[model samples]
Target: ILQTYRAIADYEKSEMALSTGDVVEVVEKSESGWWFCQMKAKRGWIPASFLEPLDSPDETEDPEPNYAGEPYVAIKAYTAVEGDEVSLLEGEAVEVIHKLLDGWWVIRKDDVTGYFPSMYLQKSGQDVSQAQRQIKRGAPPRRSSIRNAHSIHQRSRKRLSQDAYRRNSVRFLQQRR
Candidate 1:
């Protein structure tokens, strides 16, 4: 619950104060009235008066337009859900590459990149192109159908033997059968 210091008695640069009806919460209170509000969204401080506990009674009085001194509304969860609660959830802080919904955030956890529920996150605001992912996996080379046509040689052993026998027999007056 991030709470801004509501102005009380024209607080100096260091003092914490709250105006009437200002938003506030009860966490740890400093001796100086700086109340700590732990939120699923985030955590911060505020004085007693300027901060109206979100859980407490809402004082109908709206303080002056204090952008510089605006009564800090103790912001509950950012949405009905939570925002970037960096420290609340242990090991939950993630590099928000993208934002989908209040409860669903596309976060990178460990080496396994995926989505999760995150509260209070520093949005990358990086317009990551929502393009689909894929692997290069390609087709293999084609096999040759008609290959090595000229290097082939075939000879009949019986024909060669007969030819040789006839030639030799003729040289010695042998008959050809």
Candidate 2:
């Protein structure tokens, strides 16, 4: 099935080269906001944040951000990579402003607003079973950890290609086989 999308950002990662306003056909989609798309002779993965649905240009798939945040506690520590992300320590408290389906949620700690992995957070006053289950399932490999992710959410200094991500993900699935 072909789902058309318009690139809203310039993504020059891996084999995919998407300029703003470029049209592409998405072949596969991942919950981590990365999608496999084709534009003419090129085919590779690009961040979903850079694309908008061709049919519904004005509408967003995600809900509007809520400024009145929900209280949550960090079950695991996480270090930030992107400028838009925030580092969290275990047992620290934060206010979640927006929960994204990609497992990354926007949060507010003090006066700062940034993204944090929801898999590492638990709602305050809630049961630990949900967080435990998520931890057991393991977080998906970050874009920067495509090749050498020794453990979940390991620190990496550089971005890797999407092909490496695909291979790593396939190997990740093979471990259960």
- TM-scores, one per candidate: 0.18, 0.47
Top-scoring candidate (TM-score): 2
RMSD in angstroms, all models?
38.1, 19.1
Question: Model 1, range 1-177, lDDT digits (tens) per residue?
Answer: 544444233333324444454444555767986656432346564222233235333434332211111111111123222222212242233444333322333333332233333323333332122111121222111111124422122531111132342343334331121
Instruction: Write candidate 2's Cα lDDT for 48-78 as tens digits.
Output: 4344345443335566555566788988888
Error at 132, model 2, angstroms: 2.0
**What ranges in model 2 sit over 4 Å off?**
1-59, 136-177
Q: What does candidate 2 score on TM?
A: 0.47
Candidate 1 ranges beyond 4 A from true positions:
1-92, 120-177
Give the alpha-carbon lDDT of every model: 0.30, 0.66
**Model 1 lDDT on a 0 to 1 scale:** 0.30
